[PDB]
Amino acid sequence: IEEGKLVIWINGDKGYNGLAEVGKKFEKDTGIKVTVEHPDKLEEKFPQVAATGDGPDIIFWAHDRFGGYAQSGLLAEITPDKAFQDKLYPFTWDAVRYNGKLIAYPIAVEALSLIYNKDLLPNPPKTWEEIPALDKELKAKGKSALMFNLQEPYFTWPLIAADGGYAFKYENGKYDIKDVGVDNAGAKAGLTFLVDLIKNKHMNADTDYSIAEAAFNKGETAMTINGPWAWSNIDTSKVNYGVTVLPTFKGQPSKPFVGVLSAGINAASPNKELAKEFLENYLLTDEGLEAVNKDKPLGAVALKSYEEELAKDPRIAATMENAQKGEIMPNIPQMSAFWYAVRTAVINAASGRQTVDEALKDAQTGSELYRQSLEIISRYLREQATGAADGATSRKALETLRRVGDGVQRNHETAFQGMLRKLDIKNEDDVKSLSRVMIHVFSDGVTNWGRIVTLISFGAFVAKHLKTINQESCIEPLAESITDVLVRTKRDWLVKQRGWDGFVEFFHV
């Protein structure tokens, strides 16, 4: 990380051009250049690169991912003084506290709303249950009722939570990580309603963020579900739109998760004082937030003075009405594996690969298996690649891999060499495409520990090669891709065989 400049990461749906303008005023006053980037999957890239001491000086994401970053030592503790803290709403500071310390600056409070086309639908439905009949009527007109992103569980969560779904249960001042709430009748009733919309062709299982946005902004669908960042593109489209309360389900409000967009400082940054100056005295001002909000609306900002200025906006009032019906996301380190598992479940149910009951029933053990597997496989691949070593079951599993997995690479080196060579892994897309090789390992229908350890061993073999060709940052996404194949498609087998304890036992001697 280069001293004397700031590199900032923020998601590509936010006002990153507005943020760069704030950076240009910082540069004017200080001479320090501010580079704003919006990499793909930044919420996964950050912990990967920051763990090796690289990455941006400042990272923007909703607060839910920041507890895991903090737990892994990737965030600097921030040091705003009491007078600065008093300028932002207390509940926003609460979202960025982890183990008693403030680990990010809160920026703005986000929640999804119902966005509707007033020309197609001046009187939008109050209930989810009305949407099938409405869609049938609109189809007879060449339109559709509703399109929204079905690929990210954030957007279906309001419906899943409406009748009883929850992430982790909060009691006695803390979340019980052993009590996930998607395997219950309310969560299942909500996901069933969604899958039934798909089955009855009122929605398409493939609809993603870009497709839904294009449909609404071209006037083809009467409704979408999105957050404040989307309003700018709808402004550009000239669609006559309103922002309102989400439909009810079984008479109960939809419960969107509330996210606090937050900015953390990389623990490895040599620029922490510059980062603090930028965030406290340039971004978190009326003029700073205005520049970002003018690019893509932020929602209800954390800064009291500017929140009061904007609060008259009916779209923001609707955002906060939806937010009051939902819950603040947890920020515990399990959230990343939780989202992994719920994303798989919704996509499997929506596509019919699983029933709704099976999909949600799998989620809790899927998240635990993913978190544990990801840690083991990523540690092994990275230590193999670097030559240096950097919880009992995971320790024994890594000791097993150092013997058995190194052993596979010894005994089968000639095949492994010509395997990775014919594949000709030159860039980041080539590495992503290795997930197809991984699926082929199991394509004949057979699963066993030899195949599983061999795939991991080949992953380590490839990871060593990646470092030699200056693609060392691709090791963690390789590890994640192996983990995904195993957990997404072999969960049942891993459970039957007692997971990583069974792995250690199988390869003992």
């Binding site: 089968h412 594949l423 199991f442 394509s443 520990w449 030899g450 350890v453």
Partner: peptide
């Protein structure tokens, strides 16, 4: 593509060799 399938099937064959060993 054919190459990725051939590589995946070779890993499976090696994996069965390893499975038999242990």
């Amino acid at each position: 593509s054919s190459t990725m399938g051939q590589a995946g099937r070779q890993l499976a064959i090696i994996g069965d060799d390893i499975n038999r060993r242990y």
